[model samples]
Target: KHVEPQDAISPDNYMDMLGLEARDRTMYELVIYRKNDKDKGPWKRYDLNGRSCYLVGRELGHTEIVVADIGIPEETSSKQHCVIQFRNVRGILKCYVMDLDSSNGTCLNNVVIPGARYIELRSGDVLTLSEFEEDNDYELIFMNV
Candidate 1:
């Protein structure tokens, strides 16, 4: 009830939610919304920081975006949950999210990403692991600053 309709549309207001400098438009960052209890949670951020590819997992030191990094006790994610790849095609730079044959699942905007297939990601897209409606949901937002 607190978030208004316009609140979900504007990226400007989400500026404060970013982890790195919002000043750089080219560098992409991820905003995460971890569910806690019913209809309650907080947002966290992770900057892509020029990495061509990144891993998400439950294993520490093995994954760039680990579930443990978020202090999520809901530790059902696989050792290699999924990975995001930064690529350029046809003069267009894009980020792609792919499932790493996770035991659970990886979703983009409420839809499952085909296993081992790179799905192009856009700003405002949502990433979910373990389940599409996971208590642990990651959102890539407010980028094109």
Candidate 2:
């Protein structure tokens, strides 16, 4: 498969690999859903800045775990093109975002992140919500919730 960087860094492709599907290709279709369960399972409901963010996962089909960073923003901020990477991980995927040393910063677990390397998301990962305090509002992000 001629998997391009852009292709590999996509939410749809990442979700597809996990045998999951996005709600659609529209603006609102960017968010993933979570499966509810008990016993510390990798399923739960979460909030994306007062928005709905859900956990979604499935079998890997003999494929390695992968995840695309939802940090790619179409709008340029004082931080420039926020190039963050959210690896599509398998096996008990949790959710968390780290500020990739971005000009603005990344928010995870409802915390404001500074410059960092990565955010490891296990099952039931909850994003820390906070204002980027940038020059613009949110845009058609590479990953939407």
lDDT of 1 at 125: 82
In candidate 2, what residue range of length 10 has the lowest lDDT sum? 50-59
Q: Each candidate's lDDT (Cα)?
A: 0.56, 0.33
- Can you write out model 2's per-residue Cα lDDT over 53-122, one digit (the tens) per residue? 3222212224333232233221322222222333334532223334434444444444555554444443
**Which stretch of 10 consecutive residues in model 1 shows the poorest summed lDDT?**
1-10
Candidate 1 clash pair list: none
Query: Which candidate has the highest TM-score of all?
Result: 1
**What would the TM-scores of all predictions be?**
0.63, 0.32
What's the CA error at residue 97 for candidate 1, in Å?
0.3
Candidate 2's C-alpha runs over 4 A off are 1-9, 18-77, 91-96, 107-110, 120-145
TM-score, candidate number 1:
0.63
